[PDB]
Amino acid sequence: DPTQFEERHLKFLQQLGKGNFGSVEMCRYDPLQDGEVVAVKKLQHSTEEHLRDFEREIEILKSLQHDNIVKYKGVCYSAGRRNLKLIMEYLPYGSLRDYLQKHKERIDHIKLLQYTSQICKGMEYLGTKRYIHRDLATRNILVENENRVKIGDFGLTKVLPQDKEYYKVKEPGESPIFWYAPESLTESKFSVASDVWSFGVVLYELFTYIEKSKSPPAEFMRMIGNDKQGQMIVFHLIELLKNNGRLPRPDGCPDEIYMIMTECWNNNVNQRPSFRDLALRVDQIRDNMAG
Ligand SMILES: CCS(=O)(=O)N1CC(CC#N)(n2cc(-c3nc(Nc4ccc(C5CCN(C)CC5)cc4)nc4[nH]ccc34)cn2)C1
């Protein structure tokens, strides 16, 4: 509905996030001019290809309704109905990556496992639509309140072809290589199982509390050698992963939780756990610490 969010009533307030190809702004929608705060995603450095990808992303988000997925509100066909902007609920505590850093002193293991469980259920839901997220990372998780997080961005999400259980990317632009499964690096293959690999990296991130020098890029670069540049980095990352190099157990991380991470990081795609497996395992851990 192009009349739902009219550009003349959508007022900019603050910048919330920004990257090479997109940004999110805090805006106020006041049709009666005298209104709700919303989050608005727009492209940056747009092209016809990027705009078509953005249309697919909007359709993906519109099709999702789940407690742990940020809520679609609509679209603004701005610039006289010659451009597109995506309208979403505003989540007041921002990205989980920043929230964990700001509030680590009140976030214990059982809280981390609540966030883990919630991310997992969002991903179970995504898989029922045959969507592959391809960019799971704490920077793409948003915090609604102390007890609720949601997957907040779907800019790299792809729909599986009807007769295959993987999506093969041809020319990969934005590639978060230090979250990628080995078969994504070596064969450009993305699947539910590669999302599970990346979820293991998210779980690692959580239990580092986003401490300085413990991020996946920083750790993998320290193991590879900080002087390496360009494709050499990739070559070494592939060799490292294929022969069982892995992110370390974070300081203070229980062995049981590191074991979850390492089971997600199986080079054998079919042996990785399912998101249903993981959600039940994590919720049983929480419940057996204390319900
Ligand atoms: C393609 C690149 S992108 O730019 O498009 N990309 C998407 C991207 C990553 C993800 N997911 N993102 C999304 C949002 C976003 N934020 C919010 N609320 C918010 C509230 C408060 C603060 C403050 C800032 C200052 N201080 C640190 C404390 C928190 C920030 C945000 N609500 C939202 N609803 C939907 C989206 C969204 C933000 N970043 C980044």
Side-chain angles (χ1 to χ4, degrees), residues 1-32 34-47 49-170 172-173 175-291:
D1 169 31
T3 62
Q4 183 175 30
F5 292 101
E6 292 206 275
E7 74 182 297
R8 64 169 298 191
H9 297 129
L10 192 56
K11 303 286 193 242
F12 171 84
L13 290 166
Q14 299 286 341
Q15 204 184 60
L16 296 177
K18 177 166 109 233
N20 293 331
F21 300 108
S23 71
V24 177
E25 319 185 311
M26 186 193 186
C27 294
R28 207 209 182 270
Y29 193 64
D30 190 6
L32 313 193
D34 191 359
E36 188 178 22
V37 173
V38 299
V40 181
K41 185 170 174 173
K42 60 191 176 182
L43 299 191
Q44 304 280 269
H45 306 104
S46 176
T47 65
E49 199 158 319
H50 286 182
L51 264 174
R52 179 65 172 150
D53 278 0
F54 192 37
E55 185 160 5
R56 279 187 211 103
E57 170 187 350
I58 293 165
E59 186 43 69
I60 281 161
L61 187 61
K62 182 170 131 151
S63 76
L64 300 171
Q65 298 172 314
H66 186 272
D67 284 349
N68 306 118
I69 305 287
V70 65
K71 284 179 174 183
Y72 168 91
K73 292 190 87 67
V75 175
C76 178
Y77 300 83
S78 51
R81 298 196 184 176
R82 297 168 313 132
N83 199 20
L84 293 181
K85 297 180 194 202
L86 165 63
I87 317 300
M88 281 178 298
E89 74 180 330
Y90 173 76
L91 290 185
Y93 293 91
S95 76
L96 180 56
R97 186 170 65 171
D98 284 338
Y99 183 86
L100 243 183
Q101 288 173 273
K102 182 190 208 153
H103 288 292
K104 58 171 201 286
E105 295 71 20
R106 58 170 208 202
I107 297 168
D108 59 345
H109 290 170
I110 198 172
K111 187 51 83 172
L112 293 182
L113 291 173
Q114 182 174 31
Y115 301 154
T116 298
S117 174
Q118 280 167 26
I119 298 164
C120 272
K121 292 168 188 180
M123 281 321 289
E124 298 171 62
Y125 180 79
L126 204 58
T128 72
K129 312 290 195 182
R130 286 173 70 72
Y131 297 164
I132 312 305
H133 188 278
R134 298 183 58 234
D135 201 19
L136 269 184
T138 64
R139 73 179 148 95
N140 289 324
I141 307 292
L142 301 168
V143 182
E144 179 174 25
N145 58 58
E146 56 148 325
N147 287 303
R148 168 85 68 95
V149 300
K150 307 194 186 189
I151 305 173
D153 198 70
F154 299 85
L156 296 193
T157 297
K158 295 293 165 162
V159 200
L160 288 174
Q162 185 178 3
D163 51 350
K164 308 279 176 118
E165 285 309 276
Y166 63 88
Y167 186 109
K168 218 206 262 223
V169 165
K170 313 311 201 197
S175 306
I177 60 173
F178 297 116
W179 279 251
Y180 276 182
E183 73 274 6
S184 303
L185 292 167
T186 62
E187 301 199 56
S188 305
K189 284 175 163 179
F190 295 83
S191 63
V192 170
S194 68
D195 279 343
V196 166
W197 175 288
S198 305
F199 169 84
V201 186
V202 170
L203 181 53
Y204 170 85
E205 290 185 84
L206 289 176
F207 276 77
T208 71
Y209 292 94
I210 320 302
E211 171 178 0
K212 183 184 285 186
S213 73
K214 307 297 188 173
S215 67
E219 292 277 358
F220 277 125
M221 274 329 288
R222 166 190 70 65
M223 315 174 204
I224 285 157
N226 286 307
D227 291 346
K228 291 187 174 58
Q229 312 161 331
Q231 281 283 337
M232 182 73 29
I233 296 170
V234 187
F235 296 169
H236 273 75
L237 178 63
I238 287 166
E239 199 49 46
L240 182 155
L241 292 175
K242 281 199 73 143
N243 297 302
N244 201 49
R246 296 294 187 265
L247 293 166
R249 182 177 59 81
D251 292 338
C253 180
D255 295 332
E256 169 158 59
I257 303 307
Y258 192 60
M259 178 64 197
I260 294 169
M261 297 163 212
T262 59
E263 288 171 17
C264 291
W265 302 327
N266 200 323
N267 293 353
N268 190 313
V269 171
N270 287 7
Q271 279 180 9
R272 290 169 199 156
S274 71
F275 281 112
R276 199 185 299 131
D277 292 333
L278 291 162
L280 285 163
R281 181 166 184 181
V282 170
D283 278 351
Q284 283 159 354
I285 293 170
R286 297 167 59 207
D287 192 53
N288 292 334
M289 297 150 74

